[PDB]
Design a protein around this ligand. Structure first.
Ligand SMILES: O=P(O)(O)C[C@@H](O)Cn1cncn1
Ligand SMILES: O=P(O)(O)C[C@@H](O)Cn1cncn1
Ligand SMILES: O=P(O)(O)C[C@@H](O)Cn1cncn1
Ligand SMILES: O=P(O)(O)C[C@@H](O)Cn1cncn1
Ligand SMILES: O=P(O)(O)C[C@@H](O)Cn1cncn1
Ligand SMILES: O=P(O)(O)C[C@@H](O)Cn1cncn1
Ligand SMILES: [Mn+2]
Ligand SMILES: [Mn+2]
Ligand SMILES: [Mn+2]
Ligand SMILES: [Mn+2]
Ligand SMILES: [Mn+2]
Ligand SMILES: [Mn+2]
Ligand SMILES: [Mn+2]
Ligand SMILES: [Mn+2]
Ligand SMILES: [Mn+2]
Ligand SMILES: [Mn+2]
Ligand SMILES: [Mn+2]
Ligand SMILES: [Mn+2]
Lengths: 199, 199, 199, 199, 199, 199
């Protein structure tokens, strides 16, 4: 059966609902209140083949920050739930994607241990109305609740939209690879220590 | 059916014919008038599993330049023709190949948008009789007519033949990956915008 | 008869229509959804004497990016269509235009071979609401579909609007020159190789 | 039938036995007298899906060095034996694996030509009781007898155990890829020169 | 009547014949024994609209040098002869031409005073079989016998053939401009001192 | 009896035959298709007193590279075969040879463990028609199949032929020394570990 994770998360700042199918067909269904983020989440669906359902509202008159963070936190938890015990999966993903002059390498391990390595240098402060500092925060928050080791490396790029979008494409492909079935491992846990856990 | 692209292109400088099968079995059939380039195109076939048929004549007494360029232009157009609407493909390719001390990373996106990122530093001017400046020009011309985003990164290397040949091997494997069927996407166009085009 | 090129181009991101007359009288008729870009396209008409008809709509709530790019792509294709075989033209254009303290050199060759050389350093991120990174992208996309070799050199300038507008004025005058009839060449193709092509 | 290589190797310094199944199920069975190395060889099995059987004894009161080297030499020979003529294989492997803050890229070519490129900078001298200089020597010795071109690149890392273990995970995945069947090449030798050899 | 200059020049090193029509139709008829130089002289005809007739033989087994120089000297003298008293001409020419990534500015004054300013940095030693040092020498020798002030400035470029060919295109267009009739000056000498002379 | 090693090695690129007598009288009999390499192999015979018989043909129209490499590989294997168990030999060789201003130190150990240390800086790209990058590759390939530890150090030199030829003279004398009988060791294996092996 398809691996589906669902999360609802409300604070005084934001209200978020997420449903992710790891075994999806690339259904894009994201409405966060942050249009640029929606476009990025569409890459996650289109290139990762995840079914991505996201709804969020929040205090965007203060900053897109809280919405951005809370969407990411909920996506991470949805991934954690969908992944379960992580039996039989590839576990590791590794992909470098361009978008024109931009080139972004993403490597990840569905380890249970959160870590973000990130070196993007996005040369403008706003892409549309979206604060480009929020890209790093999206990935940091997602790693923290998913229990993912994630490295994002900027190999080339100048246009801020190209840099960010190449990142989401590379991430989508790496995460697709990591979450997919390993055809040789016979459903075993892919760890020498016998378990993968966020604790 | 196999995706085959064919091009014939004649100017006062050169005369070129190309036929490429994306769904080939690695048939190597290149005769450009530039022996080193023929050897490189053989890697494209051997490692990419393309069937590669190339014939060229031209003004090599002036320079290998025009022949090299026109072969590349025609190969790019043949790729464009064979790819068609680009439905159902992986779209992205990413591979790093060594040849002894040389190590070359190639990442590409069959986007419809031409771009070459290239940082090779080939330490000699002639490999056999082949002018090593012509390597960059081969890839630039190929991207321009294929509508490919292509990045070529030199990670290591000293011997010029090793550097160039590792590049063609990495390119061949990345292009193979990008052109192959995506087994999960059900024949859809791999783009959130609904189309991939060179225009 | 006047050389007119027309393009219609729709994706899930944008919808664009362009009509350009190379042999125009400077009719300015641009409405892209990006007011600053409209003002720049008016320079193309006023100084280049092109008739410039552009309509675009698109996802500007995400970013002006996709609209900007798609307008440029369509303009490039319209230029390509209008130019045809490029018989009898000057082919090359070269002009440096000031706007107050700004001074921008544009040189171009209607070669069939796309290339952008660009060194502008625009010191602010937004001119009005227009993201100044999008200037480079406009010219890159236009070159890619027109098959133009284009160099843009910033010789002086501080005010971002002056820098960008001087660029469009210099480009307009260089493109006017290149597209105009060469009064001495008797309708021949202006190339030693006997043809000019985007392939 | 499964590709299995077996080696027994005794000197006045060490006594080593190795059996490797390239077509394994990740059976981990390593006892070298060097506990840290055993843990690393377990990654080779767990992530590479090799069946790895190693026994060694030796002069560890002098140094772990001779044991470490002789284990590596014998593993390399076992790989060479199991690989045979190298018909029908992918030949090339390329993978970047993290372990928390560490990130290690491994690229290899089962060429028949030994070469190690290695740039790890392991910041401590002993991980447990294991001398960290011995990591480079393990890979160098393994390449020398297997006839492998191998590049190991440290992209990030601080903790010595993380750096070394990420290396073994990346190596395991790259070697798995290279040794696996190429589903399209019809059992042919993956070389334009018609043979792959250690001589 | 058309302004035609003819020169025959023989030494123990070379034998050269040149005929140039300033008021030509771009007839290309150059055979120097140096194929790359022939291709460059074809640009002079194609883009300058000069009729260019050149024949040379010489000691190319020693070096292309003497032939290259003697062709240039004879072309310069042919230009001087064709120009005569220089009445009614534009006198000055100024053009910047690209060839792909190369961009070369040429400015010249048909002053009667020889001078070459030249800053090309051609990154390879041989383009085909042609020694790239000989480019500077071609222009220096041509200026010396024509009595031309000539500046050649490399603004961009990497490929040696592109750099050199862009130079010849820019030179051709600048020389065309300078040699053409000034439509407003009523056949007067374009000099405040009342004469233009090589002495 | 004399220690003689013989190798025949054919690929789609090259065809090579080698016979080496370690206990020779300096018979020079090398014809590789690379005249400069033949002259170098003559030093190996003249100064090393090896009998050196080499025949090669190959794809020199592509590059001398494959021939050069394959000759070296076969020489290394011939040395390995002739050396056998390496009983009773000096094992180590060490010699510094000049050729005029050039001075090259070679130290080697017939260890069974391949390694090349090399720091030559050959200031020209072609000596005759021979690509000077191929010198390093000759020694690397020879070490790889012979199981030799080899260090080559440039102490002085400017003329490329002098540098390369001094290298071959020093190598010849060092290899002669290493392969010769140790008059005191009574036919024992010259190793504390009781064996010398390439595995
Ligand atoms: O959890 P796994 O499968 O990655 C195996 C562990 O030994 C990794 N590890 C973490 N810190 C030191 N080693
Ligand atoms: O064409 P695709 O599938 O890569 C999706 C586009 O949004 C990419 N893009 C290009 N410039 C800015 N975004
Ligand atoms: O196409 P044209 O008219 O500019 C003439 C070509 O020879 C130019 N060229 C491009 N690369 C090397 N030469
Ligand atoms: O052996 P392969 O399949 O990698 C093909 C050879 O041409 C490679 N090569 C090694 N040195 C120069 N070229
Ligand atoms: O010969 P012309 O027409 O350029 C006018 C001269 O005054 C130029 N000049 C040369 N040196 C100083 N002035
Ligand atoms: O093989 P031999 O005769 O040189 C003796 C070995 O102990 C050498 N060695 C290699 N690595 C560490 N020690
Ligand atoms: Mn926060
Ligand atoms: Mn986008
Ligand atoms: Mn070119
Ligand atoms: Mn090769
Ligand atoms: Mn874009
Ligand atoms: Mn204005
Ligand atoms: Mn050792
Ligand atoms: Mn561990
Ligand atoms: Mn001279
Ligand atoms: Mn040319
Ligand atoms: Mn080689
Ligand atoms: Mn000599």
């Amino acid at each position: 059966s398809a691996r589906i994770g669902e999360v609802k998360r409300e604070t005084k700042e934001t209200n978020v609902s997420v449903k992710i199918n790891l075994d999806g067909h690339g259904v894009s269904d994201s409405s966060t209140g942050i249009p640029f983020l929606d476009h990025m989440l569409d890459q996650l669906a289109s290139h990762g083949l995840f079914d991505v359902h996201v709804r969020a509202t929040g205090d965007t008159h203060i900053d897109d920050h809280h919405t951005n963070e809370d969407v990411a936190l909920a996506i991470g938890t949805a991934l954690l739930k969908a992944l379960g015990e992580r039996k039989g999966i590839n576990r590791f993903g590794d992909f470098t994607a361009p978008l024109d002059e931009a080139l972004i390498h993403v490597s990840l391990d569905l380890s249970g241990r959160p870590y973000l390595g990130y070196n993007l240098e996005i040369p403008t402060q706003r892409v549309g109305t979206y604060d480009t500092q929020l890209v790093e925060h999206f990935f940091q928050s997602l790693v923290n609740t998913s229990g993912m080791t994630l490295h994002i490396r900027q190999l080339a790029g100048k246009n801020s939209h190209h840099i960010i979008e190449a990142t989401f494409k590379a991430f989508a492909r790496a995460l697709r690879q990591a979450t997919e079935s390993d055809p040789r491992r016979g459903g075993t846990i892919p760890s020498s220590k016998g378990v993968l856990s966020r604790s």
